[PDB]
CSV table of C-alpha atoms in Angstrom, one decimal:
chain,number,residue,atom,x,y,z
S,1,UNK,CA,0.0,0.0,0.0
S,2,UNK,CA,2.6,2.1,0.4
S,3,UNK,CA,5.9,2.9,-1.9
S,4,UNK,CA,9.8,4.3,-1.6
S,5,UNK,CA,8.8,7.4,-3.1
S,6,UNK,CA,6.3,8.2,0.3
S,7,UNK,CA,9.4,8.5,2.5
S,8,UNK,CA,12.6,10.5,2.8
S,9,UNK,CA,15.5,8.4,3.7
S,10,UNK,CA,17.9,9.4,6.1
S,11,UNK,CA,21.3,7.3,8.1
S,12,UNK,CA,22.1,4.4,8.1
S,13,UNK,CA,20.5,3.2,11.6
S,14,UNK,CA,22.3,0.1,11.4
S,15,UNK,CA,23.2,-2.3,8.6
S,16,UNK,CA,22.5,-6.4,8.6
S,17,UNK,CA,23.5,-9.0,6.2
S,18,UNK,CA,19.9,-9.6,5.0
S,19,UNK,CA,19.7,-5.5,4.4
S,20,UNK,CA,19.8,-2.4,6.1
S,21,UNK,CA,17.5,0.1,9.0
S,22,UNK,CA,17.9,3.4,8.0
S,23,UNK,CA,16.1,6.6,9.7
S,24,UNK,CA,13.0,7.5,7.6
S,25,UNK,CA,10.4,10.2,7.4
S,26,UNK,CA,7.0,10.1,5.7
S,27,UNK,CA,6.8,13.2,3.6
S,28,UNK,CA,2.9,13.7,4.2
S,29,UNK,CA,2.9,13.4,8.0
S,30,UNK,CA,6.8,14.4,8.8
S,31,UNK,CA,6.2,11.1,10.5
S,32,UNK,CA,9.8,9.8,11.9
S,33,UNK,CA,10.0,6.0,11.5
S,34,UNK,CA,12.6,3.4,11.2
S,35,UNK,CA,12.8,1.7,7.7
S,36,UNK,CA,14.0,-2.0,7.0
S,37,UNK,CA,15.3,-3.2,3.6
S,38,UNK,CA,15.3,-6.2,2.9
S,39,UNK,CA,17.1,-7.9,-0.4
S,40,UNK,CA,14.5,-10.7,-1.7
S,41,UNK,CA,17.0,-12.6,-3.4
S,42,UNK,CA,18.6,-13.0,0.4
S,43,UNK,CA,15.4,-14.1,1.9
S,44,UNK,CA,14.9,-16.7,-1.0
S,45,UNK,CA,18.6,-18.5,-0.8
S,46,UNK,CA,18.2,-18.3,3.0
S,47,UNK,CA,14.3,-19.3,2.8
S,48,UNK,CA,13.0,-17.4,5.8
S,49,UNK,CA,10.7,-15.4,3.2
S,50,UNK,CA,7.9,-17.2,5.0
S,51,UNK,CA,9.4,-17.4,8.6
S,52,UNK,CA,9.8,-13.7,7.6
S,53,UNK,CA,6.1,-13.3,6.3
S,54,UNK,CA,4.9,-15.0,9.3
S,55,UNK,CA,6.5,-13.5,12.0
S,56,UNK,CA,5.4,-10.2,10.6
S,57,UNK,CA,1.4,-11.6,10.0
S,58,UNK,CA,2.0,-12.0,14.5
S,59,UNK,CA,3.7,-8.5,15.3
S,60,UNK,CA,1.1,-6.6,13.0
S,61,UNK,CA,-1.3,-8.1,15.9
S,62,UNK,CA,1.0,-6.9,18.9
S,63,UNK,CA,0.2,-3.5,20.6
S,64,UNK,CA,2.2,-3.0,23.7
S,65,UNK,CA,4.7,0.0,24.8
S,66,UNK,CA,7.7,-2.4,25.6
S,67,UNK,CA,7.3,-4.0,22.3
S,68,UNK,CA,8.4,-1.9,19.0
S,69,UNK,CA,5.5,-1.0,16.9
S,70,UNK,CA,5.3,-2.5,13.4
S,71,UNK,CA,3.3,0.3,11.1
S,72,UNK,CA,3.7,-1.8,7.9
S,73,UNK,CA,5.4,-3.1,5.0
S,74,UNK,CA,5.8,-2.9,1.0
S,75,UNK,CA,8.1,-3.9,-1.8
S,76,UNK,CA,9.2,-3.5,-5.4
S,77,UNK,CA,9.5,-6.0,-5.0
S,78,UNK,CA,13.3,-6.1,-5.7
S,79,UNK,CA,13.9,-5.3,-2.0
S,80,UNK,CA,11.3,-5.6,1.1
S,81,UNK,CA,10.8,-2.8,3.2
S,82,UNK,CA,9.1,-2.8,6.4
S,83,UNK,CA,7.6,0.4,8.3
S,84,UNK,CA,9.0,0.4,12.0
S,85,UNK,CA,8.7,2.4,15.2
S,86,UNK,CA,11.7,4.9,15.7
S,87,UNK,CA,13.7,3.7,19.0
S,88,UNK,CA,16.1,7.5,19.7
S,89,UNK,CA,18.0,5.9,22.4
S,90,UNK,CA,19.0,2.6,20.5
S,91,UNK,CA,19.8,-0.8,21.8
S,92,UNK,CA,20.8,-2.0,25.0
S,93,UNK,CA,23.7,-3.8,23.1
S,94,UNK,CA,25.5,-0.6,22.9
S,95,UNK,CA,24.1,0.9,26.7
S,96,UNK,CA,25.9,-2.4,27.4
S,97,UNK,CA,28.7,-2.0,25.9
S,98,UNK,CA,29.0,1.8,27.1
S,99,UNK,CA,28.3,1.0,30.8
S,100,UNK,CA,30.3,-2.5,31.1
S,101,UNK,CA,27.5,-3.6,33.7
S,102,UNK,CA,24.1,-2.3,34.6
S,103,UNK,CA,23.1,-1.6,38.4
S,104,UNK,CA,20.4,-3.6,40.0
S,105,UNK,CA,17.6,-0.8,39.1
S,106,UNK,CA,18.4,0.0,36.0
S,107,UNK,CA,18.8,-4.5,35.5
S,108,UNK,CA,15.3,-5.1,37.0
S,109,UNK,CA,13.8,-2.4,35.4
S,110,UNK,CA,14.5,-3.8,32.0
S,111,UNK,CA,13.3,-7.6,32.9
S,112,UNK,CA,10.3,-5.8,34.5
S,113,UNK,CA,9.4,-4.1,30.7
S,114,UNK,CA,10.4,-7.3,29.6
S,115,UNK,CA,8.2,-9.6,31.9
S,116,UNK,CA,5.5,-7.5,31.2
S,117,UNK,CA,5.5,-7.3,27.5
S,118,UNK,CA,6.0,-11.3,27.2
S,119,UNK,CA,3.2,-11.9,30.1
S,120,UNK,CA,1.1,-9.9,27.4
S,121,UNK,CA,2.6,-12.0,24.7
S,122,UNK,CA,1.8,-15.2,26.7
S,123,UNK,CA,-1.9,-13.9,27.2
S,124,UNK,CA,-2.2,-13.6,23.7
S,125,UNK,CA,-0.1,-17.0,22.8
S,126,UNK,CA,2.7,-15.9,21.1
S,127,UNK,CA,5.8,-16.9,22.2
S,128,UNK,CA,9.3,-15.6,21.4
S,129,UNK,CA,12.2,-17.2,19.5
S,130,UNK,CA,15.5,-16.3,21.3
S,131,UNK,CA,15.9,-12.4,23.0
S,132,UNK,CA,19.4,-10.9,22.6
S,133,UNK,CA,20.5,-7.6,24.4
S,134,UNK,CA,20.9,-6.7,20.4
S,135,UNK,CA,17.3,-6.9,19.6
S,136,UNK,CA,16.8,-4.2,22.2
S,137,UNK,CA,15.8,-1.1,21.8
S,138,UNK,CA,15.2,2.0,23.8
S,139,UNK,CA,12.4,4.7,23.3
S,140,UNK,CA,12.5,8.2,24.0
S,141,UNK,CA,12.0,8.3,27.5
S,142,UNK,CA,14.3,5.2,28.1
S,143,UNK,CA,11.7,2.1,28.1
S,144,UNK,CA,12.9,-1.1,26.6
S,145,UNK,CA,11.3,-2.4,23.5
S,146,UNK,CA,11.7,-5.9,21.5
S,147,UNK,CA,12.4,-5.5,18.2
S,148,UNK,CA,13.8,-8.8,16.6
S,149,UNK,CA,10.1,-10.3,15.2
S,150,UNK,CA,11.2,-13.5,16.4
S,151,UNK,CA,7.5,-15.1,17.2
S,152,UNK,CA,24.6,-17.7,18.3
S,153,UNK,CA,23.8,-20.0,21.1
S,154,UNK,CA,24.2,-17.5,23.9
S,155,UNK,CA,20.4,-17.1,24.4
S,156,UNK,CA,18.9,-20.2,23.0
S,157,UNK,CA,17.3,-23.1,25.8
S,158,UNK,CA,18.9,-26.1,26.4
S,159,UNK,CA,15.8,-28.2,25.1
S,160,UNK,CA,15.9,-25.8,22.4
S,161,UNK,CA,19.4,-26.8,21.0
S,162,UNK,CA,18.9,-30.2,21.9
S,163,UNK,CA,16.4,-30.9,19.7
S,164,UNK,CA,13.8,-30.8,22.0
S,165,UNK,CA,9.9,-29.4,21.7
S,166,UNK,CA,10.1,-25.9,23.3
S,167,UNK,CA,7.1,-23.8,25.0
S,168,UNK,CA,6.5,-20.4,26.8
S,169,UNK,CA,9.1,-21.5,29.4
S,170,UNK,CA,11.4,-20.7,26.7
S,171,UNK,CA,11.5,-17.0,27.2
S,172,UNK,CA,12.0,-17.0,30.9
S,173,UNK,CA,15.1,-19.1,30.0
S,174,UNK,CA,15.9,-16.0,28.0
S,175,UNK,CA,15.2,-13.5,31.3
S,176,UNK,CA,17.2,-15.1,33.0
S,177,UNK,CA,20.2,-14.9,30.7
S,178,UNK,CA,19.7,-11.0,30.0
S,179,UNK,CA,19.4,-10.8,33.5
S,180,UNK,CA,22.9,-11.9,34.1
S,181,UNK,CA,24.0,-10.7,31.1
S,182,UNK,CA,22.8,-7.0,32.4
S,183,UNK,CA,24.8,-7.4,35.7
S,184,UNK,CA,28.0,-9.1,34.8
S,185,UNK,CA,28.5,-7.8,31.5
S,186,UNK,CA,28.7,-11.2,29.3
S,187,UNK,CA,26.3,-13.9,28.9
S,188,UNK,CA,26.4,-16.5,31.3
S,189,UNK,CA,27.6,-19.4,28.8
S,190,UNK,CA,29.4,-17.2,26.7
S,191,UNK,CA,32.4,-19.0,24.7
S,192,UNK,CA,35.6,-18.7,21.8
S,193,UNK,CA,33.0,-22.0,20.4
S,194,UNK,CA,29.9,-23.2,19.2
S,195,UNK,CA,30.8,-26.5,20.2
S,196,UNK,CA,31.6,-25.1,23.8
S,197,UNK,CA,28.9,-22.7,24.4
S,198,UNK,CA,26.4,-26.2,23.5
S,199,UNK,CA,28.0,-28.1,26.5
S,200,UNK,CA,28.1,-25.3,28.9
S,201,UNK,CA,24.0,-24.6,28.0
S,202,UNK,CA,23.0,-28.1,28.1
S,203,UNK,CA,24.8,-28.7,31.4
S,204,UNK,CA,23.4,-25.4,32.6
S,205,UNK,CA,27.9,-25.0,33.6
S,206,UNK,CA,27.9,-20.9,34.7
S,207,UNK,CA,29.2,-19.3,37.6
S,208,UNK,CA,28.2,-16.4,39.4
S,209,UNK,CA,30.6,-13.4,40.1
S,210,UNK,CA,31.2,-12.0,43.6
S,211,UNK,CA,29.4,-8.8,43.2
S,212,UNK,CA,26.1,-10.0,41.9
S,213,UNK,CA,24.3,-10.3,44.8
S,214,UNK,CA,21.5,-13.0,46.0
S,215,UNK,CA,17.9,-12.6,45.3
S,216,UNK,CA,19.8,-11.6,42.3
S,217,UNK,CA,21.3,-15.3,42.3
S,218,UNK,CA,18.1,-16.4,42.8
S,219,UNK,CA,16.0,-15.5,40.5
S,220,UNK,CA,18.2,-16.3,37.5
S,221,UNK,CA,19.2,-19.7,39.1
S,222,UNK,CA,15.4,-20.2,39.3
S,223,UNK,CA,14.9,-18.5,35.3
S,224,UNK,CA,18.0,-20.7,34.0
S,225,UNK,CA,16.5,-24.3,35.4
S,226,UNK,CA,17.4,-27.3,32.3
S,227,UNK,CA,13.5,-28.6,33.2
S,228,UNK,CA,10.7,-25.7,31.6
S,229,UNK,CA,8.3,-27.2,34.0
S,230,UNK,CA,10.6,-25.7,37.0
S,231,UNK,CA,11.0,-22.4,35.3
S,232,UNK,CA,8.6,-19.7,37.2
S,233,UNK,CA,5.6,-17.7,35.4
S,234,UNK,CA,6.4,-14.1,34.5
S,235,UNK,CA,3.4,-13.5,37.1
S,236,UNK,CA,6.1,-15.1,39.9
S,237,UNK,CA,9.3,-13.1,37.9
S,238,UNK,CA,7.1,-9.5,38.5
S,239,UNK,CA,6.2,-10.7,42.2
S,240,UNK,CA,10.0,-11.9,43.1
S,241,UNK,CA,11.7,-10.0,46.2
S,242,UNK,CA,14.4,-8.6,44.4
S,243,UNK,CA,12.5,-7.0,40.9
S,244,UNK,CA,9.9,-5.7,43.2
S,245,UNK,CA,12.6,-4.0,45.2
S,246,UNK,CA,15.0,-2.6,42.7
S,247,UNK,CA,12.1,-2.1,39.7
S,248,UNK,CA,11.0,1.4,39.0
S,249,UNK,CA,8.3,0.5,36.8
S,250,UNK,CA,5.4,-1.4,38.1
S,251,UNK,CA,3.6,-4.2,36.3
């Protein structure tokens, strides 16, 4: 419905290996938006067209602050192009990567946004793929928004590299690496090999540091359990001792 003519293209937010985001504004609205290209040849030699095509047909139906808005989407069809919210204070990759760590507030503040947004994704059965601190993104007064569509082993589930059928269970796997990941400054089974990083998920094999502190301990040794069934509910994660006591935004 819509065409590359409608919008004004600006930097180069970022650039991918299946295309480019650049910084975009439609010329009838001066609306500021985020614009994806996409190469179709890529998609096709890769086929994840339809993984593509399906994971936008399930954000189109998501409306939810801590989850980045997805306007819509066109093509030439030489390239796709997809119409996305603007995030100003980009991803948590690079707040991560600028601040080393993140203190206890500022951590359970993000898996509070995060807890929330997938308790509203569980409620509405859609469950997420694999979150990474990359896939992050940060509006303009500083809330965290998932932006990756996806309805590295560093943040995949054991049962989901072992071959194993996955559920909801899988995300709080994923809170519970981000977690760490946002206090120590690496992901917990973080490697120099593929081959590696598979052993030390499937044997759930990470170690705490001295400064993270318990309650913080807990809940990710309670979000990181091998067995779904004894991973908590993201009702539990927004009720736990030490979110409630370091969170600044409520659930």
């Amino acid at each position: 419905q819509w065409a590359l003519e409608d919008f004004e293209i600006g930097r180069p937010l970022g650039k991918g290996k299946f295309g480019n985001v650049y910084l975009a504004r439609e010329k009838q609205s001066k609306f500021i938006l985020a614009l994806k290209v996409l190469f179709k040849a890529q998609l096709e030699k890769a086929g994840v067209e339809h993984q593509l095509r399906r994971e936008v047909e399930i954000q189109s139906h998501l409306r939810h602050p801590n989850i980045l808005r997805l306007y819509g989407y066109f093509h030439d069809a030489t390239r796709v192009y997809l119409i996305l919210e603007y995030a100003p204070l980009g991803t948590v990759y690079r707040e991560l990567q600028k601040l080393s760590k993140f203190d206890e507030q500022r951590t359970a503040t993000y898996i509070t946004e995060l807890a929330n947004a997938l308790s509203y994704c569980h409620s509405k059965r859609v469950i997420h793929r694999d979150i990474k601190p990359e896939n992050l993104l940060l509006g303009s007064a500083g809330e965290l928004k998932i932006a990756d569509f996806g309805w590295t082993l560093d943040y995949l589930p054991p049962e989901m590299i072992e071959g194993r059928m996955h559920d909801e269970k899988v995300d709080l796997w994923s809170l519970g690496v981000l977690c760490y990941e946002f206090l120590v400054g690496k992901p917990p089974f973080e490697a120099n090999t593929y081959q590696e990083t598979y052993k030390r998920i499937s044997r759930v094999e990470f170690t705490f540091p001295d400064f993270v502190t318990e309650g913080a301990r807990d809940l990710i040794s309670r979000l990181l359990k091998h067995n779904p069934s004894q991973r908590p509910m993201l009702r539990e994660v927004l009720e736990h001792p030490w979110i409630t006591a370091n969170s600044s935004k409520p659930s």
